[PDB]
Structure 1
Amino acid sequence: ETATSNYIHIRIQQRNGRKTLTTVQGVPEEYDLKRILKVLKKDFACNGNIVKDPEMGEIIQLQGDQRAKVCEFMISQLGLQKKNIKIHGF
């Protein structure tokens, strides 16, 4: 048995200019990370960067203010659920 709802944290990270960054915390480690990053890069105008945390956690970077759009994209391309998302900041 596996938990259906895990806390995925889409945070506000301050990027160059008045612009921001979609940073994802608490990523499910089941699918290939690099592949997902590549997919994300392809779909938007973003660059994918992964910051590694020991034992559990990987910070996934996507340059820009999308949030909802990103979530929609994730929903469209299988690998991540609908309920797992949380917007953090404002």
Structure 2
Amino acid sequence: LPAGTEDYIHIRIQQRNGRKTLTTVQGIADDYDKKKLVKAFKKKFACNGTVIEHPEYGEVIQLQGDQRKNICQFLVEIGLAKDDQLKVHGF
């Protein structure tokens, strides 16, 4: 198994117009390769999303439509979790 993740993971969700929301993740890992786990993010959460390239930052993945809770479902289902590092910024 590869190395454990770095110190903290932040999930930020913001709004766009109508009935829609635009949700981000921040700071998963710098060590972890295969950062095209958007492909596993999109195909499990049933959402359109991608990674946009932000400098000196945590390789933000933006997904459309509200999943804060489904990230909690998926990350305890998979290896990388301690379940005290995930701070929810939902409104």
Q: Relative to 1, partners in 2 of residues 1:69 and 1:89: Cα closer, same or farther, differing over 3 Å?
A: closer
Structure 2: stretches of 5+ with no match in the other structure: none
Of Structure 1 and Structure 2, the greater strand share is in: 1
The correspondence of residues 1-90 of structure 1 with structure 2, limited to 5 A, is 6-29=7-30, 30-34=32-36, 36-78=37-79, 80-81=80-81, 82-90=83-91
Report percent identity of matched pairs: 56
Q: TM-score, normalised by structure 1?
A: 0.75
Please say if residues 27 and 57 of structure 1, whose CA atoms lie closer than 8 Å, have aligned partners that are also in contact. yes
Q: Per-residue displacement from partner, 1:22-77 (whole Å, max 9, x unpaired)?
A: 2011221214111x110111112212311223344211112111211221112112
| Distance in 1 of aligned mates of 2:10 and 2:56 | 18
Structure 1 vs Structure 2 CA RMSD: 2.3
Matched positions, count? 87
Structure 1: stretches of 5+ with no match in the other structure: none
Amino acid of the structure 2 residue aligned with 1:22: T
Q: TM-score, normalised by structure 2?
A: 0.75
